[PDB]
């Protein structure tokens, strides 16, 4: 890394800086004073202060990226979000007044809830042994499972936006091959339950 | 007293090519055009073939001038990579230096 170890990662959060001094604790005051003497890495070209920045969606776009085609990855992500929103609006209009209360229409909420539903609780590690999964690994496994399922060859000629929107809605409703894969992981963990003692941590 | 018989042959080839270059250029000018009659071009072809074999420029090989290495010869200095490295490392070539970037 061209950055010397002294450089510190940038904190991009307007609220953190607009916070009044009075609300700050002594530890927080000391941290703010110290940061005035430290070097700060240049803000990456990916994340900004836009209120429409969703780190989960940014990470999903990065994962979907192929060969540094960030433009195409972003295009696919926005197309998927638009397709999800349009399907939700169509269902909302086609639905009765009662079901319109239930029918969600926010693509960001749909995406977050779908990935959360696809997050696996217990993993398997060679030691195979059932084991707890850290939160970062859970999120990455959810995202990778979603992307791999969308990239599966079983879908013929269907475009990635449509495929991913359909899979995302299925996951949001707790259905689809992604949830099936999570259930399969859980079932294998249950089957190897007896081997849980092999784990030394 | 050239380095080896191969370098001597290349020297002979260079001398012959320099001797016959003008005649070769003249005869090949007739062949390398689409204006003159095909019969004239064919007689020119047989003449250029009749010229001695060693006069062909393609037979000139760029051998190192100090060790007769037939390959790895830097044209600007006419020295095989080994001899060029020797002289440059000992610092006997102006400007050249070990590169680091």
């Amino acid at each position: 890394s061209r950055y010397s170890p002294e450089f510190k990662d940038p904190l991009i959060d307007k609220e953190y800086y607009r916070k009044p001094v009075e609300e700050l604790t002594e530890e927080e005051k000391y941290v703010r004073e110290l940061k005035k003497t430290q070097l700060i890495k240049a803000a990456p070209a990916g994340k900004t202060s836009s209120v429409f920045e969703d780190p989960v969606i940014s990470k999903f776009t990065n994962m979907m990226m192929i060969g540094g085609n960030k433009v195409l990855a972003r295009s696919l992500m926005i197309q998927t979000l638009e397709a999800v929103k349009r399907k939700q609006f169509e269902k909302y209009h086609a639905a009765s007044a009662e079901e319109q209360a239930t029918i969600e229409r926010n693509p960001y909420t749909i995406f977050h809830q779908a990935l959360k539903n696809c997050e696996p609780m217990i993993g398997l590690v060679p030691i195979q042994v059932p084991v707890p999964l850290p939160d970062r690994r859970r999120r990455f496994l959810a995202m990778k499972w979603m992307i791999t399922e969308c990239r599966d060859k079983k879908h013929q000629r269907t475009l990635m936006p449509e495929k991913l929107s359909h899979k995302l809605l299925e996951a949001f409703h707790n259905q689809g091959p992604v949830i099936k894969r999570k259930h399969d992981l859980h079932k294998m963990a249950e089957a190897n339950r007896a081997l849980a003692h092999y784990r030394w941590w | 007293h050239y380095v080896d018989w191969r370098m001597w042959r290349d020297v002979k080839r260079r001398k012959m090519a320099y001797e016959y270059a003008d005649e070769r250029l003249r005869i090949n000018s007739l062949r390398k055009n689409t204006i003159l009659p095909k019969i004239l071009q064919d007689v020119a072809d047989e003449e250029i073939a009749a010229l001695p074999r060693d006069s062909c420029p393609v037979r000139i090989r760029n051998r190192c001038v100090m060790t007769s290495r037939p390959r790895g010869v830097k044209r600007r200095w006419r020295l095989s990579r080994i001899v060029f490295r020797h002289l440059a490392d000992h610092g006997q070539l102006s400007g050249i230096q070990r590169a680091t970037w």
Partner: protein, 53 residues
């Protein structure tokens, strides 16, 4: 049938227990650092003398 609908409570307990185990690992690791190094340093100042001065 491996459906989270009712398992929510047990799954939450599992996650809390895993977090507690990780936190305990960290706390033990930090708290571990009389240690053998210090004890050996103390001993070297008073070496056993199986010979004669």
């Amino acid at each position: 049938e491996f459906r989270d609908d009712a398992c929510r409570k047990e799954i939450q307990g599992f996650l809390d227990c895993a977090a507690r185990a990780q936190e305990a690992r960290k706390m033990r690791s930090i708290q571990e650092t009389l240690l053998p190094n210090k004890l050996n340093k103390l001993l070297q100042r008073f070496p056993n003398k199986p010979y004669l001065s």
